Design a protein around this motif. Structure first.
Motif, PDB file in Angstrom:
ATOM      1  N   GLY A 102      62.057 -52.853 -27.268  1.00 29.21           N
ATOM      2  CA  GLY A 102      63.426 -53.137 -28.252  1.00 29.21           C
ATOM      3  C   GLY A 102      64.503 -53.477 -27.137  1.00 29.21           C
ATOM      4  O   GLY A 102      65.645 -53.485 -27.548  1.00 29.21           O
ATOM      5  N   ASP A 103      63.983 -54.024 -26.050  1.00 29.88           N
ATOM      6  CA  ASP A 103      65.358 -54.451 -24.921  1.00 29.88           C
ATOM      7  C   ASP A 103      65.547 -55.643 -25.410  1.00 29.88           C
ATOM      8  O   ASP A 103      65.011 -56.642 -25.678  1.00 29.88           O
ATOM      9  CB  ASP A 103      64.383 -54.316 -23.546  1.00 29.88           C
ATOM     10  CG  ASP A 103      65.317 -53.607 -22.630  1.00 29.88           C
ATOM     11  OD1 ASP A 103      66.637 -53.846 -22.543  1.00 29.88           O
ATOM     12  OD2 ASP A 103      64.939 -53.366 -21.503  1.00 29.88           O
ATOM     13  N   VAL A 104      66.877 -56.054 -24.953  1.00 28.92           N
ATOM     14  CA  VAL A 104      67.483 -57.276 -25.022  1.00 28.92           C
ATOM     15  C   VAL A 104      67.493 -58.259 -23.830  1.00 28.92           C
ATOM     16  O   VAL A 104      68.196 -57.571 -22.724  1.00 28.92           O
ATOM     17  CB  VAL A 104      68.771 -57.232 -25.843  1.00 28.92           C
ATOM     18  CG1 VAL A 104      69.019 -56.974 -27.122  1.00 28.92           C
ATOM     19  CG2 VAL A 104      69.627 -56.164 -25.083  1.00 28.92           C
ATOM     20  N   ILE A 105      66.790 -59.084 -23.776  1.00 27.64           N
ATOM     21  CA  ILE A 105      66.816 -59.966 -22.734  1.00 27.64           C
ATOM     22  C   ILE A 105      67.834 -61.259 -22.597  1.00 27.64           C
ATOM     23  O   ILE A 105      67.565 -62.405 -23.184  1.00 27.64           O
ATOM     24  CB  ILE A 105      65.358 -60.604 -22.298  1.00 27.64           C
ATOM     25  CG1 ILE A 105      64.331 -59.501 -22.349  1.00 27.64           C
ATOM     26  CG2 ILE A 105      65.498 -61.472 -21.183  1.00 27.64           C
ATOM     27  CD1 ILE A 105      62.928 -60.008 -22.360  1.00 27.64           C
ATOM     28  N   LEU A 106      69.177 -61.059 -22.173  1.00 24.18           N
ATOM     29  CA  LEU A 106      70.161 -62.119 -22.149  1.00 24.18           C
ATOM     30  C   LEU A 106      69.764 -63.458 -21.261  1.00 24.18           C
ATOM     31  O   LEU A 106      69.376 -63.023 -20.033  1.00 24.18           O
ATOM     32  CB  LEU A 106      71.450 -61.584 -22.032  1.00 24.18           C
ATOM     33  CG  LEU A 106      72.122 -61.423 -23.151  1.00 24.18           C
ATOM     34  CD1 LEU A 106      73.508 -60.297 -22.958  1.00 24.18           C
ATOM     35  CD2 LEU A 106      72.731 -62.544 -23.852  1.00 24.18           C
ATOM     36  N   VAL A 107      69.715 -64.442 -21.841  1.00 25.11           N
ATOM     37  CA  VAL A 107      69.400 -65.601 -20.767  1.00 25.11           C
ATOM     38  C   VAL A 107      70.759 -66.463 -20.826  1.00 25.11           C
ATOM     39  O   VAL A 107      70.595 -67.481 -21.649  1.00 25.11           O
ATOM     40  CB  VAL A 107      68.188 -66.144 -21.315  1.00 25.11           C
ATOM     41  CG1 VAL A 107      67.712 -67.401 -20.062  1.00 25.11           C
ATOM     42  CG2 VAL A 107      67.033 -65.344 -21.279  1.00 25.11           C
ATOM     43  N   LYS A 108      71.134 -66.561 -19.661  1.00 17.88           N
ATOM     44  CA  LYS A 108      72.471 -67.679 -19.479  1.00 17.88           C
ATOM     45  C   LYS A 108      72.096 -68.644 -18.799  1.00 17.88           C
ATOM     46  O   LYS A 108      72.849 -68.910 -17.658  1.00 17.88           O
ATOM     47  CB  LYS A 108      73.719 -66.899 -18.880  1.00 17.88           C
ATOM     48  CG  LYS A 108      74.849 -67.934 -19.284  1.00 17.88           C
ATOM     49  CD  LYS A 108      76.041 -66.942 -19.245  1.00 17.88           C
ATOM     50  CE  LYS A 108      77.299 -68.058 -19.328  1.00 17.88           C
ATOM     51  NZ  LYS A 108      78.640 -67.191 -19.741  1.00 17.88           N
ATOM     52  N   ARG A 144      60.890 -77.268 -18.588  1.00 18.81           N
ATOM     53  CA  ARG A 144      60.165 -78.219 -19.741  1.00 18.81           C
ATOM     54  C   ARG A 144      59.030 -78.644 -19.163  1.00 18.81           C
ATOM     55  O   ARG A 144      59.036 -79.489 -18.479  1.00 18.81           O
ATOM     56  CB  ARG A 144      61.344 -78.948 -19.994  1.00 18.81           C
ATOM     57  CG  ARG A 144      61.901 -78.653 -21.407  1.00 18.81           C
ATOM     58  CD  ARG A 144      61.259 -79.111 -22.433  1.00 18.81           C
ATOM     59  NE  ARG A 144      61.303 -78.027 -23.581  1.00 18.81           N
ATOM     60  CZ  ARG A 144      60.612 -78.227 -24.775  1.00 18.81           C
ATOM     61  NH1 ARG A 144      60.373 -79.559 -25.185  1.00 18.81           N
ATOM     62  NH2 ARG A 144      60.394 -77.279 -25.547  1.00 18.81           N
ATOM     63  N   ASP A 145      57.701 -78.434 -19.667  1.00 17.53           N
ATOM     64  CA  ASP A 145      56.398 -78.927 -19.171  1.00 17.53           C
ATOM     65  C   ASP A 145      55.350 -78.378 -19.988  1.00 17.53           C
ATOM     66  O   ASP A 145      54.793 -78.969 -20.782  1.00 17.53           O
ATOM     67  CB  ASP A 145      56.219 -78.511 -17.722  1.00 17.53           C
ATOM     68  CG  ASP A 145      56.481 -79.781 -16.944  1.00 17.53           C
ATOM     69  OD1 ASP A 145      56.025 -80.686 -16.909  1.00 17.53           O
ATOM     70  OD2 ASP A 145      57.673 -79.645 -16.099  1.00 17.53           O
ATOM     71  N   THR A 146      55.068 -77.323 -19.797  1.00 26.41           N
ATOM     72  CA  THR A 146      53.929 -76.619 -20.685  1.00 26.41           C
ATOM     73  C   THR A 146      54.248 -75.447 -21.598  1.00 26.41           C
ATOM     74  O   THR A 146      54.232 -75.505 -22.668  1.00 26.41           O
ATOM     75  CB  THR A 146      52.717 -75.854 -19.602  1.00 26.41           C
ATOM     76  OG1 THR A 146      52.369 -77.225 -18.840  1.00 26.41           O
ATOM     77  CG2 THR A 146      51.585 -75.701 -20.421  1.00 26.41           C
ATOM     78  N   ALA A 147      55.001 -74.526 -21.111  1.00 31.04           N
ATOM     79  CA  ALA A 147      55.638 -73.422 -21.566  1.00 31.04           C
ATOM     80  C   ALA A 147      56.407 -72.356 -20.782  1.00 31.04           C
ATOM     81  O   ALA A 147      56.405 -71.383 -20.779  1.00 31.04           O
ATOM     82  CB  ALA A 147      54.368 -72.516 -22.272  1.00 31.04           C
ATOM     83  N   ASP A 148      56.978 -72.891 -19.685  1.00 31.44           N
ATOM     84  CA  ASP A 148      57.758 -72.331 -18.770  1.00 31.44           C
ATOM     85  C   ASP A 148      58.822 -71.468 -19.420  1.00 31.44           C
ATOM     86  O   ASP A 148      59.050 -70.335 -19.292  1.00 31.44           O
ATOM     87  CB  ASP A 148      58.451 -73.181 -17.734  1.00 31.44           C
ATOM     88  CG  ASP A 148      57.087 -73.908 -16.787  1.00 31.44           C
ATOM     89  OD1 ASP A 148      56.847 -73.135 -16.161  1.00 31.44           O
ATOM     90  OD2 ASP A 148      57.250 -75.057 -17.061  1.00 31.44           O
ATOM     91  N   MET A 149      59.358 -71.953 -20.603  1.00 34.04           N
ATOM     92  CA  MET A 149      60.651 -71.363 -21.130  1.00 34.04           C
ATOM     93  C   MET A 149      59.975 -70.515 -22.520  1.00 34.04           C
ATOM     94  O   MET A 149      60.707 -70.215 -23.263  1.00 34.04           O
ATOM     95  CB  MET A 149      61.707 -72.301 -21.533  1.00 34.04           C
ATOM     96  CG  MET A 149      62.759 -71.412 -22.449  1.00 34.04           C
ATOM     97  SD  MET A 149      62.827 -71.713 -24.081  1.00 34.04           S
ATOM     98  CE  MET A 149      63.774 -73.377 -24.021  1.00 34.04           C
TER      99      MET A 149
END
Length: 105
Positions: free
Chosen positions: A58-64, A71-76
């Protein structure tokens, strides 16, 4: 629940300091700032490889991200799926959240 943030230096200048402050401004603890020193001998995508083993239940991963997550296969989307299965959340600076449970909640 913890405040984890993901970062990655994009400029030769003090980029890492620009990402950490971006996570703290978002609501991330400085002690939990898994950034990526891309300015090295080669690319450095370990901030998520280690974050995948540091996020709690249940941790929150903030991504700024201030340039591009990948963007290519699934990096994000790879680590995003690895976290969704670990019962971890991922807050996105784009609008606070990104895909917080997109099944039927």
């Amino acid at each position: 629940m913890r405040l984890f943030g993901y970062a990655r230096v994009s400029t030769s200048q003090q980029s890492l300091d620009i990402q950490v402050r971006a996570l703290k401004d978002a609501g991330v603890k400085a002690n939990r700032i898994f950034t990526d020193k891309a300015s090295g001998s080669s690319s450095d995508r370990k901030g998520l490889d280690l974050l995948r083993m540091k996020v709690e239940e249940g941790d929150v991963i903030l991504v700024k991200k201030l340039d591009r997550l990948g963007r290519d296969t699934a990096d994000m989307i790879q680590l995003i799926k690895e976290f969704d299965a670990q019962g971890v959340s991922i807050r996105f600076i784009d609008d606070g959240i990104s895909t917080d449970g997109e099944m039927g909640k």
